């Protein structure tokens with residue numbers, strides 16, 4: 586069995602190996618990469634996402650989200666308070682202000698310490714989930730707006746044609762902006778490219794151990810667990826590495842830098858934080874190996890998780906018993 590300790594693997598594809606996306610994902614899995622839940626891919630030196638980022642300040646962040654925490658430093662939830670619209674140039678200036686900027690630090694490890702000590706006492710503002718792309722149309726390799734669609738994968742594997750579309754999303758971050766513990770919708774893969782700026786630290790639980798994280802989360806957030814049998818789908822709960830280690834939960838950590846891709850694998854729980862002003866692009870995708878995970882994915886039916894149009898068909902075809910209840914949650 587490859588990668589039996591479920592370590593995060595880092596890949597350095599050549600320009601030739603960067604041509605065929607599906608083939609390279611399958612290669613990484615042949616080496617056991619998926620056992621970690623997360624892999625890093627460093628693009629060949631010949632590749633670029635676009636020529637420059639000099640012209641992005643006029644992108645609008647229609648609904649910036651202030652991420653307000655509740656709880657204790659290592660075990661907290663966050664809610665998202667909507668703020669007034671601002672441009673990427675305005676948000677970058679905000680990120681760099683004395684109130685929001687990254688503090689002095691020695692290295693990534695000191696910064697991580699400071700994040701977990703102090704996160705709850707601040708409310709950073711995240712420009713998340715903005716439909717769009719920063720890849721140049723002429724970038725042919727690993728262009729997250731030109732990937733094979735999940736609808737087409739489901740049709741190829743299962744024969745059934747379904748409605749829905751699959752497009753990327755932009756994320757503009759600042760110091761302490763946080764992504765809560767989650768798997769993807771329908772336990773899909775994700776791919777995330779850090780276009781520019783400061784790093785993103787990730788934490789991940791191996792897919793084979795995801796239920797251990799779920800059981801801890803039920804213990805640590807007992808009201809939320811009574812409210813919903815899949816409350817991690819709400820994407821609000823944070824648990825620190827120290828608390829995970831105290832509770833024996835297997836996990837790994839890695840820091841992504843500008844110019845690097847991360848892939849999350851089906852049912853790989855992940856969480857993390859941004860080091861300073863940055864911009865990432867991410868999209869979900871599927872492979873043949875996903876279908877069995879999609880059939881087994883949990884679902885929130887309490888009403889909180891509220892998701893895209895395209896998830897309807899995935900539930901309807903892969904999970905027909907659950908469909909009626911899940912759709913009640915959507916309506």
Ligand SMILES: O=C(O)CNC(=O)C(=O)O
Pocket residue numbers: 756763764775776777849855865867868
């Ligand atoms: O970058 C972020 O805020 C969150 N990203 C992801 O959870 C992902 O790419 O799957």
Ligand SMILES: [Mg+2]
Pocket residue numbers: 640641642643644
């Ligand atoms: Mg612009």
Ligand code: NI
Pocket residue numbers: 767768769775849855
């Ligand atoms: Ni994710």
Ligand SMILES: [Zn+2]
Pocket residue numbers: 812813814815816818819885886887888889890
């Ligand atoms: Zn729910």
